[PDB]
Amino acid sequence: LTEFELVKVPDPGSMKFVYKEEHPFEKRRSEGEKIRKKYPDRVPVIVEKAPKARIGDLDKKKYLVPSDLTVGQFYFLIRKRIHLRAEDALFFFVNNVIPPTSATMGQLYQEHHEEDFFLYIAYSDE
Amino acid sequence: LTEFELVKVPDPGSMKFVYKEEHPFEKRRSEGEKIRKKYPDRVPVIVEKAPKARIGDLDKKKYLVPSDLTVGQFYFLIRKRIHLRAEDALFFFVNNVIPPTSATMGQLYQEHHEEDFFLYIAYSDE
Amino acid sequence: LTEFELVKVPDPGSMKFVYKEEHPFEKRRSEGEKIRKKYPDRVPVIVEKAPKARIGDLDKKKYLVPSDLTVGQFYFLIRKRIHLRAEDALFFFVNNVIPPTSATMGQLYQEHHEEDFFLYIAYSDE
């Protein structure tokens, strides 16, 4: 109708991870499988900023996160790795889905890790 | 005891939706059923501000939200439809319950939509 | 690797509740069991601030929370019991785990209450 607003659907390939552009698949999978052997109780995570976000960027992309660490605990870690105000927000995006903070990184990894053994998380304040 | 605080229970009919006051039930249900036929993969949502909230109001009440859109994605949409600061918060309330942002609007609709085929969401910063 | 960051694991006994230090177990359990008899549809909750948090402290530690109250509703209650700005954040921690706001306090109590019939919640903005 004229008074309804038709909500547009977000483009699922809007977020492009630089780590996937610069490294071919076989190199990434070989790297992720080695890190899984060295740290079987940790999960390799790629964290990049959404290009539209205006909060600070990350010095390092790659993180070895323990499986029992929750998403909420990982949220406070990433905040203390970028330049932002205490009042600024930050949201994690895994396949454009904000994961529950009560879930562990191991549960989030086991459900959404890609074929290169890496879990890709985008962050943005908007 | 004297040192305990007895937490009061929030009145479940504190939130009154204006769309339900101005339109009788048969008119709302006939409107919601038509919009479900025209857009079977979308859900009609009524979004109104809690009267006590001091953040900006909504120009439009009615939204046709795709079923696969998550609550978190719908959260960013409503923020970009009202006047508020980047530091201001916003929370959705469905029957005075804050829905999980990881849930899809279709799942939220199928569980809480009323008899007029509409899903009612209240928002407030407090 | 040199480019990975090894995420440290948070000390689970970092948070010490003052209510447990000042009162022995038998006194706390006897207090919690009495309050469960007087209010079978309410749950006793101990809320204390994490020492590292810079937001305001709580005048009262002990709260009798109805079982059907959600964590999100209890979140707004605690905000209106301390000195903080509208832009300041606040997070609940139960065993260093941020509980889902959609869960009820009764569900959260039944899963995480300790042997003294009390549910211990820590809060902090960081």
Residue numbers in the entry:
A (entry chain A), B (entry chain A), C (entry chain A): -13 to 112
Provide the authors' own sentences about this structure as they appear in the paper:
The S249 site is reported to be phosphorylated by ULK1. The determination of the crystal structures of GABARAP chimeras containing phosphomimetic LIR mutations S249E in PIK3C3 and S96E in BECN1 provided us with valuable information to explain the increased binding observed upon phosphorylation. The PIK3C3S249E LIR bound GABARAP similarly to the WT PIK3C3 LIR in its C-terminal moiety (from residue F250 [PIK3C3] to P256 [PIK3C3]); however, we observe some variation in its N-terminal moiety. Similarly, the phosphomimetic S249E mutant of PIK3C3 interacted with K48 (GABARAP) via a salt bridge. The S249E mutant LIR peptide bound much more strongly to GABARAP, GABARAPL1 and LC3C, and even bound significantly to LC3B. Thus, in vivo phosphorylation of S249 may enhance the LIR interaction in PIK3C3. Using phosphomimetic mutants of known phosphorylation sites preceding the BECN1 and PIK3C3 LIRs we revealed a marked increased affinity for binding of BECN1 to GABARAP, GABARAPL1 and LC3C with a striking increase in affinity of the phosphomimetic mutations at S244 and S249 for PIK3C3 of up to 19-fold.
The latter contains PIK3C3/VPS34, PIK3R4/VPS15, BECN1/Beclin 1 and ATG14 and phosphorylates phosphatidylinositol to generate phosphatidylinositol 3-phosphate (PtdIns3P). Two hydrophobic pockets, HP1 and HP2, in the Ubl domain of Atg8 ensure binding of the side chains of the φ and η residues of the core LIR.
